[PDB]
From TrEMBL, chain B:
It comes from Salmonella typhimurium (strain LT2 / SGSC1412 / ATCC 700720). Keywords: Cytoplasm, DNA-binding. This is RNA chaperone, negative regulator of cspA transcription. GO terms for molecular function: DNA binding; nucleic acid binding. The gene is cspE. InterPro entries: Cold_shock_CspA, Cold_shock_domain, CSD, CSD_CS, CSP_DNA-bd, NA-bd_OB-fold. Its main location: cytoplasm. It holds the Pfam family CSD. Gene3D superfamilies: 6.20.370.130, Nucleic acid-binding proteins. GO terms for biological process: regulation of gene expression.
Length: 67, 71
């Protein structure tokens, strides 16, 4: 439900961060959130849409889809 | 890989959860830092804007900090 860009992602460890478009704080994303359709990874800079959930790492991204 | 440590300023750091990002001095992309990389004695944390010295691992894709010391 909100839009952002992948700031940083590590493939093997299975996590990264997304910068929301509204300029609010970066949110954690786990590979299990990535809706695909192949490699569960995200490229630095990629535009995504996601929902915020309250997880072990604080505000986190759920249901992450490519834009 | 790197000739030496480099310097930077902490971009943001969640002091309770123990992770954040460092902006390197050299203009390259922000580097992820977890509390376990912090060398400081005691409760391991960083403050936003804090000056640090550190090593980088994984530079091109998902770079992470190692050996982080407060300047």
């Amino acid at each position: 439900k909100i839009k952002g860009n992948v700031k940083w992602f590590n493939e093997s460890k299975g996590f990264g961060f997304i910068t929301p478009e509204d300029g609010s704080k970066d949110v954690f994303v786990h590979f299990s959130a990535i809706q695909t359709n192949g490699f569960k990874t995200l490229a630095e800079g990629q535009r995504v849409e996601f929902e915020i959930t309250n997880g072990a790492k604080g505000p986190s991204a759920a249901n992450v889809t490519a834009l």
